[PDB]
Amino acid sequence: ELIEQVIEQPDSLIISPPSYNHIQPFVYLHNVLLILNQKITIDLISLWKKCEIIVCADGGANSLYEYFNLQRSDYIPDYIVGDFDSISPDVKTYYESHGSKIIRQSSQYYNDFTKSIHCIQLHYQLNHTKENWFESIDEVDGLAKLWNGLNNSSDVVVDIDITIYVLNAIGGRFDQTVQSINQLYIMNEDYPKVTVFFITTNDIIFLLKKGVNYISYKNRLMFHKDNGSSPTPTCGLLPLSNKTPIILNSYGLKYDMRNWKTEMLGQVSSSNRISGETGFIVECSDDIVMNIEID
Amino acid sequence: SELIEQVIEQPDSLIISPPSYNHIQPFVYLHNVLLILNQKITIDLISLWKKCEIIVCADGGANSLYEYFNLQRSDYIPDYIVGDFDSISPDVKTYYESHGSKIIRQSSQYYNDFTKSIHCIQLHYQLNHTKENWFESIDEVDGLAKLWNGLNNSSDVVVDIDITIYVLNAIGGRFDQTVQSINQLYIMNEDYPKVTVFFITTNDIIFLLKKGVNYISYKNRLMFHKDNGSSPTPTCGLLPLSNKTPIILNSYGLKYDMRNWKTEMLGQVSSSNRISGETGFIVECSDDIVMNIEIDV
Ligand SMILES: Cc1ncc(C[n+]2csc(CCOP(=O)(O)NP(=O)(O)O)c2C)c(N)n1
Ligand SMILES: Cc1ncc(C[n+]2csc(CCOP(=O)(O)NP(=O)(O)O)c2C)c(N)n1
Ligand SMILES: [Cl-]
Ligand SMILES: [Cl-]
Ligand SMILES: [Mg+2]
Ligand SMILES: [Mg+2]
Ligand SMILES: [Mg+2]
Ligand SMILES: [Mg+2]
Ligand SMILES: [Mg+2]
Ligand SMILES: [Mg+2]
């Protein structure tokens, strides 16, 4: 079998575009903003303005509220969903009194993240026709059932491009972090036209799709404040799925890989860097998570 | 198999009697080693420190330790400070260097500060009792990695020594670092089963459940779960993050107990589970699997 190679490249390279997946993770610097329960440390307003719909997952509402501790009243989430065991009474009242669509789901088998995603998927299927499509659903798992029902009735338009920016889904309770990644892989397998970006305090996390991927951006300066001790943005390729091992070929990373097999309990490329000034290429034998540091 | 994958909703409180099995006592802290990575320290550092024999700072982790005192900072000097040193600040570096910390610089581009620190820890328990300056004059690029390797090829390794390593700031920061840490957790257990690793974060404690039966015990849940009222049970999760999938689970004592429940990424993963066992619980797994338990002391 081919030699697993790692090529140390110069700090800067120009990679020409490659039949392939084109990812533009930094365009933000059908858009949906999903807010989970963690203190918001990014330029919320800037992202918000680029999104068509904003959804708060239970406690995410508190996070949005507290962000204003700008007029808090100018940023009302379209939907607030979950079992509501974290959202605070005052916050809940506040947004309810401002028109946020409340979807309480008491199911102990789906978390607020999943319930919110279902709400988002159902929104792009039923909202344009019925603004209050959510009001009469089952209180336990109506979102789960309804999304399942629509597919059973063939009433689902599988042809709609959605980009979901998720805040506060990574970095908190570890099981929540892993569940989010799990759903990232699952959603791509089930709904390939939905692109998910987890934007955290330290980086942006997305999925590289089986095959050739071309990640582009104007330049690295848009997401990596000019260094001097850091001529390159940090990144990683994380094989967190049940498909192992994954073969990687990269062009444009500081430590470029050629037929390099990656898997947990094996070698994992972390602390890699981006040398491509305008983009880089990653070919993978199966879906794999990639994180790029932002600062 | 063909067995039904069951999930049993248990009452908020249960008493599970002890089960050969792996006994895990994650909260005894509420051969101990403290490994400090680069992130603001939010835990009760001094209490943990006082329970540890050796303390190691992975590069930037020294800054984290330093800033914690912004108690006398001078009373807590780390035994070792290792890594490529591209994050530790000159000031902090000089500060601890002037206080006796053993400095081990490693410029290798193929191992991170975490791994270099672990190697230093493993090497310490092998060579330090012999010579306090065993680390000096080692290769500047990957001497630790080489030494650990050469030491094994020389059969000079004391394979029988129980070590418990408490790691701070390895989870929750840059995601690739989080993943690499978990990767190492699995690798270390495969290669060094006598070393027990506990990742203590701002939100939880993360450790490995070992293939077979595991009995997790503690005085009571009040030890790590500040009395509830609207939260009668501590939160936990079982995360199949290895290359061995799927993993079959059987639990006794969790709010949502599993029986012959198959878990894997791209499939079902038990998250937001809770702990019903008042003094402990049991998890049997077909292969090693990560478990996190939320902490709020
Ligand atoms: C095998 C298994 N493991 C765990 C669970 C628990 N569970 C899965 S998602 C669901 C709700 C999670 O609620 P949230 O999204 O508010 N997260 P939380 O704040 O309750 O920890 C629960 C309790 C379950 N139902 N089944
Ligand atoms: C296939 C592959 N991927 C990535 C790398 C890069 N790499 C692995 S660990 C090593 C050093 C990591 O340094 P640190 O522990 O200080 N973490 P950092 O602050 O540099 O991001 C590097 C640069 C590599 N050498 N090979
Ligand atoms: Cl550039
Ligand atoms: Cl208790
Ligand atoms: Mg909730
Ligand atoms: Mg809940
Ligand atoms: Mg929920
Ligand atoms: Mg370093
Ligand atoms: Mg470094
Ligand atoms: Mg290093």
Residue numbers in the entry:
A (entry chain B): 6 to 23, 30 to 40, 50 to 89, 100 to 325
B (entry chain A): 5 to 23, 30 to 40, 50 to 89, 100 to 326
The study reports:
The production of thiamine pyrophosphate (TPP), catalyzed by TPK, is critical for both catabolic and anabolic cellular processes. In yeast, this thiamine phosphate is then hydrolyzed into thiamine before pyrophosphorylation by the TPK that catalyzes the transfer of a pyrophosphate (PPi) from ATP to thiamine, resulting in AMP and TPP. CA1462 is a homodimer, with each monomer constituted of two domains.
While we did not get crystals of the TPK/Thiamine/AMP-CPP complex, the TPK incubated with thiamine and AMP-PNP produced usable crystals. However, the structure revealed that instead of a TPK/Thiamine/AMP-PNP complex, we obtained an unexpected TPK/thiamine-PNP complex with a TPNP molecule in the enzyme binding site. This result is consistent with the earlier suggestion that the pyrophosphate group is transferred at once from the ATP molecule to the thiamine moiety. The nitrogen N3 in the TPNP molecule is symmetrically opposed to its equivalent oxygen O3 in the TPP molecule. It is stabilized by a weak electrostatic interaction (3.28 Å) with the S301B γ-oxygen in the C. albicans TPK/TPNP complex. Three magnesium ions are stabilized in the active site. The first two ions superimpose exactly with the ones co-crystallised in the C. albicans TPK structure with thiamine. The third magnesium ion is coordinated by the δ-oxygen from D113 and D115 and one oxygen atom from each phosphate group of the thiamine-PNP. The last coordination of this Mg2+ involves an oxygen atom from the free inorganic phosphate symmetrically positioned with regard to the AMP phosphate shown in the mouse ATP binding site (Mg2+ number 3). The equivalent glutamine (Q206A) adopts the same conformation in the C. albicans TPK/thiamine complex and an opened conformation in the C. albicans TPK/TPNP complex. The structure containing thiamine only exhibits the closed conformation, while both are present in the TPK/TPNP complex.
